[PDB]
């Protein structure tokens, strides 16, 4: 079974999921129509708390024509030892061996798969192969662990950068202003560890995800339909050479995948 469902027509899906006359259902329909203008299909993403990572990462890897420089950098493979040695408190995490080997294994898996998809004869082969990648819960969750680690590292970099007074994206300031998220340690303990288990990602943390995988995340928020927030971008002012992935969030409680070019 795939964690990313086979595509079905977007308005057929809409009609299936929203019936009954309520302003909510209407808003959902209007939003879905607006999306249906630029995208033909929709793929339901699994609703385990990994959903944000699943959608963003699937979208990013399925269209990946080349290995990003940051993923190619071998220094990255030395990151877990370097980081964990410096900050002990990182030793609190979740699912003989240890955290360093786990994170390194995961990062290696990420780079290996991404690179594999990147070098393939045809785009079609890449799409099918990426579909084959999200079937098995194991490799997939390994990837998500890797992504979470990247989020943590980037967060630490932002905190350190702020403390010495360097210029930082404002979302970092807002992120650490949370009583539960005051420091990277508190971020890990009260937020990241619950990601995939007891809770998803807050909007402020979507910025962190974007910075982590260095992809621009475009989200259609249907509840935001007639407002200026209908299309919301993480981050607000993205680097120009970053790829753009697109997500759909009905009521901000979950993410699915809109599709245009399919098999």
């Amino acid at each position: 079974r795939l964690s990313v469902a086979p595509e079905m027509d977007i308005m057929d899906y809409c009609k299936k999921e929203w019936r009954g006359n309520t302003q909510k259902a209407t808003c959902m329909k209007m939003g879905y129509e607006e999306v249906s203008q630029k995208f033909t299909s929709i793929r339901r993403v699994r609703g385990d708390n990994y959903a944000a990572l699943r959608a963003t990462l699937f979208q990013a890897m399925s269209q990946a024509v080349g290995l990003p420089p940051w993923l190619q950098d071998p220094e990255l493979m030395l990151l877990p030892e370097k980081l964990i040695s410096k900050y002990n408190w990182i030793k609190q995490w979740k699912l003989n061996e240890d955290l360093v080997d786990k994170i390194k294994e995961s990062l290696t898996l990420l780079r290996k798969k991404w690179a594999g998809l990147a070098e393939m004869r045809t785009a079609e082969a890449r799409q099918i192969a990426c579909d084959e990648l999200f079937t098995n819960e194991a490799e997939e969750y390994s990837l998500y662990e890797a992504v979470k680690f990247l989020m943590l590292n980037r967060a630490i970099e932002l905190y350190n950068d702020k403390e010495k007074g360097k210029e930082v994206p404002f979302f970092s300031v807002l992120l650490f202003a949370r009583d539960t998220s005051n420091d990277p340690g508190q971020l890990l303990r009260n937020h990241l560890n619950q990601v995939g288990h007891t809770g998803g990602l807050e909007q402020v943390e979507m910025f962190l995800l974007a910075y982590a995988v260095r992809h621009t995340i475009q989200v259609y928020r249907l509840s935001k339909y007639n407002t200026e927030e209908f299309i919301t971008v993480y981050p607000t002012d993205p680097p120009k050479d970053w790829p753009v992935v697109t997500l759909i969030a009905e009521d901000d409680r979950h993410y699915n995948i809109p599709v245009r070019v399919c098999e």
């Binding site: 944000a52 807002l174 909007q203 407002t227 200026e228 979950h254």
Partner: protein, 149 residues
């Protein structure tokens, strides 16, 4: 005086306030305008998270000052509601969502009036006003919907 409250998307909201207004008052006003629940609301000024008890003048917030609104809403989770006829409805929800909200969403999707809905989980009838996490309803948990007349 008027103040600005900005979301993470840069959207700017204008509020009519007095410096004697408490933070929870501001949260209630934001609820009245944008429809955002206060419990999901987190107000931040100058890198500090404002407290419900305190007022604006306490934080030295002047006219035309800008506050930032960082929501506590997570997202990434769905559950299943199984009807007696066999069909399963897939709901996109948050752990802090009330049973009231779940029933309301079920009305929004299937047209079934909330007053006729009875949600059962683990042998227990769920009650309006409590939350999914209160009943220890995890991701991909399954609820049973029975109807009345």
């Amino acid at each position: 005086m008027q103040i600005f409250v900005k979301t993470l998307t840069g959207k700017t909201i204008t509020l009519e306030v007095e410096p004697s207004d408490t933070i929870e008052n501001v949260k209630a006003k934001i609820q009245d305008k944008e429809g955002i629940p206060p419990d999901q609301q987190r107000l931040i000024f100058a890198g500090k998270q404002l407290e419900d008890g305190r007022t604006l003048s306490d934080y030295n917030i002047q006219k035309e000052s800008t506050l930032h609104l960082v929501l506590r809403l997570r997202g990434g989770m769905q559950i299943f509601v199984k009807t007696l006829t066999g069909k399963t409805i897939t709901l996109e929800v948050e752990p802090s969502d009330t049973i009231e909200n779940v029933k309301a969403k079920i009305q929004d999707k299937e047209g079934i009036p909330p007053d006729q809905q009875r949600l059962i989980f683990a042998g227990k009838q769920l009650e309006d006003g409590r939350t999914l996490s209160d009943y220890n309803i995890q991701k991909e948990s399954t609820l049973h919907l029975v109807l009345r007349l």
